[PDB]
Structures are given as C-alpha cells and as structure tokens.
C-alpha cells in the first residue's frame, strides 16, 4: 500500500477552471516537494470536455506508478470513469490515484486532508498538505458508487450524488466559477432566501440488511420488499456522499471517513424554515449541523439507493457535475480503488 | 463533534446497578446526577438491576418508543448486557439505534473513560468522571460507535462494545474481582502481583488489517467457520507464545489506562494489541505504568505489537482459554470477531 | 510460503508401485502424523500409467491446499505434466505439491530430505522425514525442465533427463522394481558387464553465456544450435544426465554441489573410453557424494540453463524422471522457481 | 563433499604479498607451506605482488593453461584482486574456472577462516590456520563458490568473493588500518573505540529474499538500474536508520568471527544482516563478543535482522557512504548487487 | 430426466469406505468387483473415505463431468452422504441426475438388498450379494428412484434415500454401534436386548395417505401450522416404533415391505402401537427375514402407503435413524419426491 521510490506520475492538470492558476500553483507549491520526494512527473494539460476521460481510456498505464489529478472533483470523476470504460477496467481501476486541489470543488482533497489529521485548511495550504500526502506515498482503498440511469447509462461516482437544493446551487453556481469556493455560498444563500422544494421517491438499502450490482433490481421493477421506501415525497435535497466533506469548508459528514462498502445518505424533508437551513448550512462548516434538533434532516448509512423524481426530469450533480435524469439508482462497492492518503 | 442530538426536553430510562460505586450507585445517582438532569429538563425513571442478565432481559422486552435514551449506570458489564439485549431482539435493526449513555458507577468504566477523553476532558476518575459523563448527557450530543461481533468454538454469537482480552489481562480481571472494593486500583494490584507470578499462554492469532480488505443479527462477511483455516489475505502471527491478546474498540482500557493513544478508531476499525512471550517483567511493568499517560508506545518494545484490524481469530491451544469480554469472564476454545461500523449511538460530546 | 492450518490435501497413492506397500505405509507412518498436524487427506489410488495424469488434468483444484504424491518420481512426473497439460496451466502449476517416498526410485524425496538437513536415510526413515516436512507446511519453489522432442512432443521434467547407461539401466531394471533402491545397483552391475557406448551429439548453454511458457533459449530442432552454445567435440558417450536436484536416487548423491540455483540444472556426461573398473568406482563413490573427488577425465560437469541432445544412429532411449521415452532428439530449457513443493 | 579435484602431481602459481603477516608472508611460505607442497607433489612458482592492482593485472594477462591452480597468499584483499582480474578478461567465462586457493597471511582472512570451518577444523588462527589451509591444498579437493556482482551509482561494476559492509563495520575496517601491526585483534580495539561514539547511518535498504524469486561480463538479471525503484516483489526495509548492513557470502567475517552460524549458503544465496538504530553500546558489544563462538543469534536481539537473499540495494542518505568490499575501502552514493551461483572454484575439504 | 442406461465404455468414480466388510472393502473390491468391471470396459477410480461427511464434501465439490456414474461401496449411510452432497450444490438440479450405484460392503446394505430383489435375484448376502450388484453395474441399466425430503423444527432440510426410523429401530441402530464390529447380526442382538427392555416412546404421528433453492414440498405446511385437514392424524400417542421406508428391504436379510415395490412418489409407513408382547415383536422381527411378518395380522403392526408424514416426539426429544445415520429432534416431516434420481438396477 505504498508507491515505489523513485516513481513516476502522470499529472493531468486543468490549466483553467476555478482560477486560471492551476499550472503556476503546481509549479510553486507542488513541484518543489515532488523533487525532494523523487517523484518525477509528466504534465498533461486537459483542454475541454471528456479530454481527460479519453486520455485515460487510451493510456498505457504501465508507464505510470500513479495518476495525479489537479483540478477539482470533476476531473477525478472523468479519470475514474475513463478507467472504468476500458476493456481492462479490472486491473486499470487499481492504478493508484491522487487528488491535488485547484478547482472550486475540492471535496475529495478536503476529505483526505481531514482523514490525515489536518485542520480544515483551504486553497494553498490545502494544496501543500495534499501534496505532502502524495510525497509520503502511502495508499488506502476507497469506495466507489456504481450508478444506473433511466436510459440505461452506467456511470461511477467517487464523491457524491445530489438532488434538489444541492444540484441547483451547483448548476446555477457556474456563472461564478469566479468566486472560487465562495461561489457555493452565494449560490446557496440566494437559493435559500428564495427556497423551494422538489418531488420524488427515495428508497435505500441500509447497512443492517463493470462489477455486478447484486443489490440492485432493474429500474423498471419495484425495489425489493426489504428496502426502505421513504414515506415523504417532498424534499429540499437528497444527498449520497462517500466522504467526510462536500467542499473544503463543508464538513458535511461529521462521523468522518466511511467504512468499506458504506455511503452516507442524507435528506432534508420539506417543511424547514429558511432560517433553520441557513443555521444548518452555516453549522456544516464546522460539522455541527447534526448537533441541532431538526426532524427535517435525516441521516442513514447505506449500501444502495434509488431516487425517482416525480413528474419528468430532476437535475442531478454527480461529483459536482450536472446530469439530467428521471431515475437513478446506485450501489457502493467497497475498497475498489487506491488513493494516496495518510 | 456530534452526529445527532437528544430532543429537549426528553425522557430517559435509567438502569442502575445498586451494588455498584461499590454499594452506592443509587446515592451517587441522587447526589451527582439527578440535580443535573433536573436543570437539563431530562425526565427519568430509575429501574434497578443487580441480578445477571436482568438488564439484558428488560432491554429485550422494553417498548423502546417511550424513551429518548437508555442510561446505564454501572460498569462496562452493564453496557455489554444492554447492547446484547437490544441485538437479540427480532427488531434489532431498529432497536440498536436507541441512543445509549454510560454513567460510571461500577468497577471498570473504560467506556465512560473513553468518552470523557473524546470530549476533551482530563483523565478523571470516580465522581469527577461521573459528573463529566452526566454533563455530556446534559448536552445531549450523540455519536455512532463500532460494535464487535463475536463467535465462540461452542457456536455462541455475542457482541462487545469495548474489548476482548485473553492472557494476562483476562486473568488479572477474573482474579481481581475480590479486591473490587478497592475500586479501580484493583487492576493495579492484580497486575503487580501477577507480573511477579507471570504465566504465559500458548495459542494462534490471525487477523485482517484494515489495509488488506478488498472488494439472527448482521452477517459477519469477513469471517469463515472456525474449523476452516483463515482466508489467505489475513496475517497469521508466527509466534504462538503470548503474555496477552487485546482487541479494543476505544481509547481506554480503564479510567486510568490510556491504552490506545494513537487516534480514535475509524468506522469499522478496532485496535489489536498482543504481547509475545519472553518479555522482561520490568519492561512489562514500565509498559503498564506508562499506560496511564498513554506513553507506552513511545518505548518501542518490539515485543509489543499493535495493528488496526477489521477482524481476528484467536485459538488457545491447550484447552478452553479464559477471556474477558467487556470485563465479563467467558471461557472457550476459540473465538473470532469482526467489527461493524457505527452500529449504535452514544451520548458523547 | 506456508500451507494453511488446518488444511486439506489430495493424496494420489500408487498402491502397488515399488514393493507394493504404499497403502499400509501410508496407514502406519503417514496418517498418524497428519492427524496430529490437522491435515485432512483424501486418498485416490492410481490404476495404471497416465491415470494420475488424467485425474489431475481434470481435477477441481480449488478444493485442495496441496497435492501429495505417494509413490516414486514417476507419479510426480505424471502429476506435474497433468497440471501443465491443462488450459489453466498457469495457475494450476502453482498448486503446492509434496512427494512422499514409496516407489523404488525416490530421488526427489531424497533431495528434499537432504535440503531439510537430515541424513541420507532410506525407506521408512525417509518416508517419516518427508512426512515431518509436510506437517510443518513450509513451501519453496523448484525449477522445472521444459522439453521438446523430434516428433514435436512437449513434456516437463521435475528431476532428470538421462540417456546412455542410466536410461538403459532404468528400462532393463524394471523387473527388479521389488528390490527398492537395489534395483539400480544390480541394474548397474549387469550393464557394466556389457558396457556399451552410444553415439550422439550434445550441445548446451552454460550459466555464464546467458501453450506453456516460452523456451526463449531454444530454437527449432531442425535448425543448428545458436553460435553461442557449446557443442561437445566428443560424440561417443557412456551417459548424459541432466539433473535438477542433488540426488539421483535415495542413495545416489549425484550432485554433491547440492541444490541448484534458480533456473539452473546440473548436466553430467561420461565420455567413451572409461574403463569398467573406473565407472564402477564413480558409481559406488556416488553413494556418499564422493565421485567427483576422483581424477577422471571422462566425467564432465557443467551447470546449464539449456541443452540439446541428438542420438545419431536412430532412435535413442531416454529416461525422463525415470519414465522411459524413445526419441531421435531432445532439447530443453530449465525455468526458475516454477512450482511449490513442501520442503525445509 | 568435494565437487572436483586437482591433478596429482600438479603445478600452481603462488601470488604472495611480502608486506602481509607483518612482512613475514614469504618467510611463513618458506616455513609452513613449502615443505607440505614438496610432500604433496605440488610444484609451485612464487610471484611477489605488493603494489596496487599488480596481482589483478598479472591474472588478467596470464596464460592460465600453464597452471592447475592459482594460490593467493595474503588476505581477502588479494583474493578480491585476483577474482576481479579473471572477470575483467575477455575470456572471463573460462578464466573464472581456474581453481583458486586462499592461504592466510596477516589479518583480514575471512575467506580462509570459512573454508577451514567448512572442512571441519576448529577455529584456529595465525600459523595453525595457514597450516590447515595448506593441508586443504595438499588434499586437492575443489568446491564451487558464489560470487557477488556489484554496481555503484558512479557506474562501476565489481565483484566480491566475501562481503559488502556499510556503517559501523566499514568504519572500523577503515579506522582500524593503523593498528594493522596488532593482527585480528585490531577489529576488537576498533569496535571497542568506535562504540564510544556509536553513530547511526541513514539509508535505504531493499533486498530480494530467496523464497520470493519467481520465474561486459555476466548479466545481473535480478537488478534494475539504480535510478528506477526496485521491483515490487523485493522487500524495502522500513527503518532508514542503521548501525550496520552486511552482505556476507560465507560463515566467517574474520578468523575469530563466526558471523553466520545458521548454515552454509546454498548456490546463488548469501546472508544479509543489518542492525537497526537504537541498540545499546553494550548489546552491540555482546553481539560482537558472542560472534567468536557463533552465538550472537542466540540473544534474539530485536535490532539485528538476518535474511537469506539473492540481491540487495543500499543507498546511503546524505551523499556518499563508506563501504568495505572484501575488507577494502570503497566510497559511493549507492550500491546494489546480486549473487551468482557457484561461479568460481576453490580448494576446500 | 433422460434414458436409463450407462455409456459403454464408461468411467466411474468409486467411493469406498475401507473400514468396511470388517476392513475388507478394498480387498472385496479387488477380488470381486474389479475383474467384472474390466470385462465390461468400465474404467474406475477409487477414492477412500475416512471421516463422517467426507463423502458428502467430496461429492459437493466434485467436477461431475469426469464421471458417468458414482459408485458407493460401503453401506446405506455413504449413499445418504452422496445424495445430500449432490442436493447441497448450487447446481443441485443437474447434479442430482448423475447416476448412482450401490455396492454392498459389510453391514447396512438395505438399498443394495432392495436392488438385488427388484432385479429378480434370490435374497443373498456378503460376497454373493456384492457380485450381483456388480453384475447390475456391468449391465449398465438404471431406474428412477424416490427421494424423501425432510424438514426439521430447527430449520434443517435434508434428504433420505431409504428410511426414517424412530423408537425401537432407532435405539437399536444407536446402541448397536458399541459392537458394530459384529456386522448385520448386531441388529439381531440389539433387538434381543431392547426387547427384554421393551419400552414405548411418546409422540404424535400424522400422514397423507396415497388415496388422497431445493425442490418444493407442496404437501407440507410449516411445522407450526397444524397439519392440513385431509391428513390422517393417528390417535395413539405411544409407539414402539415408526418407520418411513422407501424400499422393500431394511437390511440384506430383512425383507420388511413384501407387498410390492413402491410406485413413483409413494413410500411405506409402518408403525407398531403400544401393547404388543415381546414374543410377538420378536416373531415379527424373525419372520421378516423371508417377508412373512405381515401374514400375522397382528393388530399392533400398522401399514399404510403415504406420500407425506409428520412425526412429533413428545417426550422432549427423539433420536432418529435416517438411512441408518443418527440424528436427534423434537419434530420432523417429509414428502416423497417421485422418480427423483437414477440408480443402477435391474
Ligand atoms: N496402479 C498401478 N499399476 C501399475 N502401474 C502404475 C499404477 N499407478 C501408476 N503406475 C505407473 O507405474 C510407473 C512407475 O512409477 P514410479 O512412481 O516411477 O515408481 P518407481 O520409483 O518404482 O519407478 C509410473 O509411470 C506410474 O504412472
Ligand atoms: O454543492 C453544494 C453544497 C452545499 C450547498 N448548500 C447547502 N447544503 C445544505 C446541506 C445541509 C446538510 C447536509 Cl448533510 C448537506 C447539505 C443545506 S444548503 C449547495 C451546493
Ligand atoms: O483490565 C486490566 C488491564 C491491564 C492489566 N494489566 C496489564 N496491561 C498491560 C498492557 C500493556 C500494553 C497494552 Cl497496549 C495494554 C495493556 C500491561 S499489564 C490487567 C487487567
Ligand atoms: O537410475 C539410475 C541411476 C544410476 C545408474 N547407474 C550409474 N550411474 C552412474 C553415474 C556416474 C556419475 C554421475 Cl554424476 C551420475 C551417474 C554411473 S553408473 C543407473 C540407473
Ligand atoms: O570487520 C569488522 C567486523 C566486525 C566489526 N564490529 C562489529 N561487528 C558486529 C556484528 C554483529 C553482528 C553481526 Cl551478524 C555482524 C557483525 C558488531 S560490532 C568491525 C569490523
Ligand atoms: O570514563 C570513561 C568511560 C568510557 C571511556 N572510553 C570508552 N568507552 C568505550 C565504550 C565501549 C563500549 C561501551 Cl558499552 C561503552 C564504552 C569505548 S572507549 C573512557 C572513560
Ligand atoms: O435396523 C434395525 C432393524 C430392525 C430392528 N428391529 C426390529 N424391527 C422390527 C420390525 C417389525 C416390523 C417391521 Cl415392518 C419392521 C421392523 C421388529 S424388531 C432394529 C434395528
Ligand atoms: Cl515522468
Ligand atoms: Cl480431505
Ligand atoms: Mg465538479
Ligand atoms: Mg519413474
């Protein structure tokens, strides 16, 4: 569970999204540490969409000891799905992966920084720490969510599946990739000041009760009897999350790192006041949002779920990336890829 | 940091063992706990236990809906009975989610000690510890905790909230029950006297470390039947001569035994410690004493081994070995266990 | 590197090879030890040549922690070729093996007993020791010899390939199977009295000059040998012997330099011109591993990774791990650490 | 036990360093060796070899066909030169088969001490050792021996017949040269003095264990370039702080240092020892002292590791390390090696 | 499913218990079976079977494709292990169709004895018996056989090829082991002892007579519901013995069911009710040798053909003999499945 020393690493870096500085930051904050650690690297700049995915899908992986993704959660989403689309996905997905933050959504990197014992740092301190994790070369396994859509598309998630309030802010937030991390804050405040609700059917398989998704039945079927069908059909948000953090300053799952093959499921049922949600959002920065007595926020650890938006298409965010659908279910696979971490 | 709250106000069932704080749990409840509850607008009802499995049988038949939490005032022993009672129920999946609370009266209060530690408190003992744990109850914050599922050679399946010990620790526990009046110092006594009457224990230990896991009640998917060898991806310990084996889910082995000073266990993880035969008494004593301040690791005894595990199997090797399970004696030929992540909720802060 | 405890093992036992006592020996000398070590076994009895091979070719290998072969070297020859003939040969040949001596030729079990530190014991003493080795469950890799014949047969050797004197004694010997180890002794004295030489050409590739696995050192038999190979000038021989282990039988410590390195085998040959009396000296000295301490210009030793051998007069008779094979030419390459045996 | 024999009668080239044995090598030849050769019908010719690489250049250019054996009278150092001289030859593959013989003079006679041991003699020293090695040559028996192939960061490739040492052992071989007049006891004095400032050495050690191998001169197939990491099936040692690392091909480190009592190396195998930082001075000394009787393994000191290997890599952190190769000083950034099975032949019994 | 013959030539796996025919099974095989096989071109491989359940694990993990049939050379208890092993495989549906064959070695060869009877042979024993069944295998003809599906209160689901016995029969099978070394004869000595100690057992017996995952037992209702209303609930609550028997013989010399071979899906149910005299019970036992026991019309001995039954021992628990293998429970029930597997027969 350690990278060779010396080793070599492919760094797939997005020179633009977030700030336009990803490459200069690499140079000032990442590179000097790589050199002392004897990690030589090659930079490949990712031009546009699916570029990274297609690169990884066609890559001779045997030349690399790890792949490092320097951008946001989206890039890592691209990389892991590209490895999963290959004929040789079974061995390909075992290539070690690393996440260095530059984008606006650095949840995976913020999570790993958390697991390593660091304070909840941000930006350049976050980059440096994640870089230090890479330089110590230690790897641990990570869970993978297998998704399935209304139209028979399989995709994989490494961080989260979101619906309702969260997906909306993520969508409308893009018109300020400019504000950085803060774009989600402005984007929440204003959706929150003008709060609304969404209609669907949530079901899941709690912990108590491509790879085969043994727990899932065709989306056409009713769920199995042993699943839990949520009574409500009116939510402010549904969220499946595989890690501790939603962003570098959103400690959304204060019980910490998930167990193998388990995901965090949250939902806010309809009825909350805007002042409560704000209070909750705000509390989430320090991960204090569960310390509040609010029958509207429900938490469950699960291995599977299904969400059907009532009346046409709901907007979903998968690892922060927008997605239109009418029905998705998914199952968590344990310990399915290696990441660098402490 | 907290992952849930009790309602305010709330109602609480209190299971108390009157032969505890040796003999005066009730008076401690009355002096140290009740007035704090009253100000926190926590209603309670006191139920008195005493007899074996009583608390277990009660929790098994309880209508859990009337209570916001179960507060167990006694030792680790009583928490063990309650959790096993909830797990034995037909509706165990929902019953294990009733929040639980540990208020130290009994002899061994490692659970309460750990939670006081997690909360940022000094390492306190007796009534300072009781007051701290009650303060936690008053603040109402909940965290999920891991649970160890155990299986014995005789086919018993049982749960453990704190610890499985074998060898020196298990003997000293069983012995020591005479000096129980002497309160928590009963273990320092036992440990001192047995460290001079050292005996070793032969058996086989295997385990599954965290890093090496691939892709009635819950199923323990990591475990194979005891008559089968362990899976090849496990570590099978070479040494078959032991002073002790300890599986521990928490930071503390007693109100003054900071046994696991590396960090708090992740979800689905516990600490495994064993001490292989041939250590010198004086090194074993320095380990003990340094344990009080959690400095025993700083010594690298390469006779003492620690590993974060998700499951283990332990076979003594010369008849029905003597184990302590969350402090309670149990004898059997072989035992194995797997941790289940965040299975029940406790008051903590 | 170690079998599971408890474990389960298939014993392929040939019930009448050697003196024909294998099964009672297993019952007397082996079974009590396996019970104490917590090794369940199932016995399968072999009925004829190739039986063992066929059982192993079609066997469900996932039910077994090892295969124990209780016979001579020939049964192990059959078991290993059985695994190599399977489509899943690459994982199959990684099943651990163990050899318990109970035929007349027990070179492999004698070599393993030697590597484990014991004395050069015979019969039930040998059987006991090799059982003590299984009970302790330790495993180490062995080399494998890959062979190609003129007819285009591909076969594997775990122990030896022999031509000339040795191959002839093995075949003629067969009627003294009942005499255990003395089979080769009587067999040797007899052949000595009618000492013949044999015509052929020998080439090899020494250690310095360096569907199944690929034999990268080998080229088609029809083509001449690589220029970097050694082509022995001599062309009349008394014997040629490729040997992967230290013992040629339980009392023939043929390779006193001991256990081969990975990927290496012992090649010996005796050139034409030796007298009967000297060949007899070498042979008796070989009991104690002393035969190389004699000044004998006819006995040549080289460690090699490959060899080719062509009997120029028609079909030469070979013994492969003691099994008779007839052929116009053979070549082979040894592969390192190709399978697991129980040893110490 | 012998794997070949010298002819009787035979003739031998004797390469002798007149400076060794405190300058008495030639007179020791005359008193202890010559009279035995005569009775054994061994002819000889003596060639004096004292300047640097002299003996190496001799063996490189010699017509080896005129000799049955080369006998080397001096230390491990001269054996080292001769063997490297043979391997530097364009006909090295036949040259390296010339039987070699090691006759002890002076100190640093670990090779002669091992052969004397393999043959069954007591651990004798000085003239007794010389006599014994001489009686081995008269008996004419030959055995093949392992050879270590080394590569340094600077790109040099060399061969080692005995050992590669780094850290404390190398520092003492080096600091020790001044008391060369005292003989073998200089390593005691050197060890004793250097123990006072026991320093540790920072580096990275990786090796290939015997059981883990799967499927210019000779090719070193187990080795990859010094700038690539070692193959993933090697063991990288976690500790990066050592007092010593020793690769050793034979039983003796010196004529009174039975360092490898666990048994003679099989073909293609060597011993690897290292001492992790944090042993006390006293225990290091006790391990040293116990080495006289090959008893140092009996302490099971947790700081001393032994492993049979076929290849290793050792990379001093902090620029150049000081190494000893067959006792001779060599300085380098990084060194790796692998053992070649039974490459040359030596007289032994 | 399919036709009732073996291929010629064929190859066969032989599971032999060596500790049988008092330690002679293998020698019996060598002198009595092997030369017959060789002439019929039946290839075989022998595999020996030590411990309890060993045959069962072996058959459960076996690559069935290598074999045209599995021969069991032991007693009824080995056949029992073999079938249960086949029925425990994920692929139980195809596995249960591999033909089986039963060669007698030593005691407890009811099944073998039945087959030899159905074949038209005289009631022979030991080596004569072994030779006949071997001739059967050489002739290569097969018949379908009934299989009994058993469920226990503890949720245990097992299968019987021959019998479920309780009371007097089960005790004699148990108490018999302490001198198995005596052979078939030991059943006679156990019988003689239990008889002087004649006792009854408390129980409730119910059946469905002929007139009115795993395989589905649709005649059976869960052991907690009462039996369906059309079943016959026997009034007696005290028995000397109860015996579900799928074949004509209880042993080589015990022709226990002479009223005719069972049709597909039928089994024999016998019971002896409380009150029979010792001398009478013993008369039944002795006359059963030549199948003459029913000719007594002794009112204590009851016979019915059935398709399903329920037995509830109510003196706490009961020990059963299931194909002669011992087992203990508070409640069992079963349903015969018709023509469920293949066996060499004539
Ligand atoms: N039951 C059997 N009857 C006759 N020959 C057999 C039997 N089982 C195996 N054989 C064959 O007999 C040959 C001799 O076996 P081997 O193990 O080499 O013993 P030995 O050491 O006496 O040569 C092997 O080729 C083997 O396949
Ligand atoms: O990517 C986004 C992240 C957070 C938000 N904002 C909000 N999150 C929440 C919220 C509260 C609790 C949990 Cl567990 C998760 C999210 C309420 S408002 C919007 C988009
Ligand atoms: O309940 C008990 C606790 C400790 C003891 N005695 C001892 N424990 C230890 C010990 C040392 C190290 C660890 Cl990690 C844990 C316990 C040494 S002596 C006996 C009973
Ligand atoms: O299986 C056999 C083994 C040896 C022999 N006989 C002989 N072997 C030899 C011999 C001599 C030297 C060596 Cl290195 C090996 C064998 C001489 S006579 C016959 C059959
Ligand atoms: O040439 C030298 C040999 C030994 C020493 N000194 C020492 N060696 C050791 C030592 C201990 C154990 C082993 Cl296996 C080998 C050497 C301890 S101190 C110095 C120079
Ligand atoms: O008071 C003194 C103490 C040590 C010394 N000198 C030396 N000590 C050592 C030495 C060697 C081994 C040990 Cl364990 C301790 C000291 C070598 S030189 C001199 C004066
Ligand atoms: O395996 C055994 C077979 C028969 C017996 N003993 C007896 N069986 C009977 C008997 C009577 C009538 C029938 Cl239909 C069947 C058995 C009477 S005494 C004991 C053990
Ligand atoms: Cl690179
Ligand atoms: Cl088995
Ligand atoms: Mg994104
Ligand atoms: Mg043979």
From Swiss-Prot, chains B, D:
Q: Where in the cell is it found?
A: Cytoplasm; Nucleus; Cell membrane; Endosome membrane
Q: Which residues form the DAGKc domain?
A: 7-154
Q: Look up and give the membrane topology term.
A: Peripheral membrane protein
Under which main EC class is this enzyme filed? Answer: transferase
GO molecular function annotations of the record: acetyltransferase activity; ATP binding; calmodulin binding; D-erythro-sphingosine kinase activity; DNA binding; lipid binding; lipid kinase activity; magnesium ion binding
PANTHER family linked to this entry: SPHINGOSINE KINASE, SPHINGOSINE KINASE 1
Record-given protein name: Sphingosine kinase 1
Q: Which organism is it from?
A: Homo sapiens
Q: Which gene is transcribed and translated to give this protein?
A: SPHK1
Swiss-Prot record, chain E:
Q: Which UniProt keywords apply?
A: ATP-binding, Calmodulin-binding, Cell membrane, Coated pit, Cytoplasm, Endosome, Kinase, Lipid metabolism, Membrane, Nucleotide-binding, Nucleus, Phosphoprotein, Synapse, Transferase
State its Enzyme Commission number(s).
2.7.1.91, 2.3.1.-
GO annotations of cellular component type:
cilium; clathrin-coated pit; cytoplasm; cytosol; early endosome membrane; endocytic vesicle; intracellular membrane-bounded organelle; membrane
| InterPro entries for this protein | ATP-NAD_kinase_N, Diacylglycerol_kinase_cat_dom, Lipid_Phosphate_FormReg, NAD/diacylglycerol_kinase_sf
In terms of pH, the activity is described as:
Optimum pH is 7.4.
Activity regulation note: Acetyltransferase activity increases in presence of the kinase substrate, sphingosine. In Purkinje cells, kinase activity on sphingosine increases in presence of VEGFA. In neurons, kinase activity increases during the first 24h in presence of Amyloid-beta protein 42 to decrease after 96h.
Q: Broadest EC class?
A: transferase
Major subcellular site: cytoplasm
Where, by tissue, is this protein expressed? Widely expressed with highest levels in adult liver, kidney, heart and skeletal muscle. Expressed in brain cortex (at protein level).
Q: Which positions bear Phosphothreonine?
A: 188
Amino acids binding substrate: 74-77, 173
**Motif interval(s): Nuclear export signal 2:** 156-164
| Described purpose of this protein according to its UniProt entry | Catalyzes the phosphorylation of sphingosine to form sphingosine 1-phosphate (SPP), a lipid mediator with both intra- and extracellular functions. Also acts on D-erythro-sphingosine and to a lesser extent sphinganine, but not other lipids, such as D,L-threo-dihydrosphingosine, N,N-dimethylsphingosine, diacylglycerol, ceramide, or phosphatidylinositol. In contrast to proapoptotic SPHK2, has a negative effect on intracellular ceramide levels, enhances cell growth and inhibits apoptosis. Involved in the regulation of inflammatory response and neuroinflammation.
Reply yes or no: does the keyword Lipid metabolism apply: yes
GO molecular function terms listed in the Swiss-Prot or TrEMBL record:
acetyltransferase activity; ATP binding; calmodulin binding; D-erythro-sphingosine kinase activity; DNA binding; lipid binding; lipid kinase activity; magnesium ion binding
Q: Which gene encodes it?
A: SPHK1
Name recorded for this polypeptide: Sphingosine kinase 1
Positions with a binding annotation for ATP: 17-19, 49-53, 81, 106-108, 180, 186, 323-325
Please report the record's description of how this protein sits within the membrane: Peripheral membrane protein
Task: Tell me where in or outside the cell this protein is found.
Answer: Cytoplasm; Nucleus; Cell membrane; Endosome membrane
Q: Residues in domain DAGKc? A: 7-154
Q: Which reaction does it catalyse?
A: a sphingoid base + ATP = a sphingoid 1-phosphate + ADP + H(+); L-seryl-[protein] + acetyl-CoA = O-acetyl-L-seryl-[protein] + CoA; sphinganine + ATP = sphinganine 1-phosphate + ADP + H(+); sphing-4-enine + ATP = sphing-4-enine 1-phosphate + ADP + H(+)
Q: Which organism is it from?
A: Homo sapiens
Motif Nuclear export signal 1: chain residues = 142-150
Top-rank taxon of the source lineage equals: Eukaryota
């Amino acid at each position: 569970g350690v990278l060779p020393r010396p080793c070599r690493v492919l760094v797939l870096l997005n020179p633009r999204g977030g700030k336009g500085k990803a490459l200069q930051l690499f140079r000032s904050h990442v590179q000097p540490l790589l050199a002392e650690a004897e990690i030589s690297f090659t930079l490949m700049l990712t031009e546009r969409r699916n570029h990274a995915r297609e690169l990884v899908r066609s890559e001779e992986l045997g030349r690399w000891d790890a792949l490092v993704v320097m951008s946001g959660d989206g890039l890592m989403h691209e990389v892991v799905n590209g490895l999963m689309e290959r004929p040789d996905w079974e061995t390909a997905i075992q290539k070690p992966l690393c996440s260095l933050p530059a984008g606006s959504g650095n949840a995976l990197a913020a999570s790993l920084n958390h697991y390593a014992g660091y304070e909840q740092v941000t930006n350049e301190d976050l980059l440096t720490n994640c870089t230090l994790l890479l330089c110590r070369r230690l790897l641990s396994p990570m869970n993978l969510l297998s998704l399935h859509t209304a139209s028979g598309l399989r995709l994989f998630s490494v961080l989260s599946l979101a619906w309702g309030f969260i997906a909306d802010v993520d969508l409308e937030s893009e018109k300020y990739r400019r504000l950085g991390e803060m774009r989600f804050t402005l984007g929440t405040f204003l959706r929150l000041a003008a709060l609304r609700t969404y209609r669907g059917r949530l079901a899941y398989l709690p912990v108590g009760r491509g790879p085969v998704d043994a727990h899932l039945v065709p989306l056409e079927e009713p769920v199995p009897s042993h699943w839990t069908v949520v009574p409500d059909e009116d939510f402010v948000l549904v969220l499946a999350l595989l890690h501790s953090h939603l962003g570098s300053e959103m400690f959304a799952a204060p019980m910490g790192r998930c167990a193998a093959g388990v995901m965090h499921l949250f939902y806010v049922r309809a009825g909350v006041s805007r002042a409560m949600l704000l209070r909750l959002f705000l509390a989430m920065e320090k991960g204090r949002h569960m310390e509040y007595e609010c029958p509207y926020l429900v938490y469950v650890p699960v291995v599977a779920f299904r969400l059907e938006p009532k009346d046409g298409k709901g907007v979903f965010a998968v690892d922060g990336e927008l997605m239109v659908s009418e029905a998705v279910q998914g199952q968590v696979h344990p310990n399915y890829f290696w990441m660098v971490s402490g």
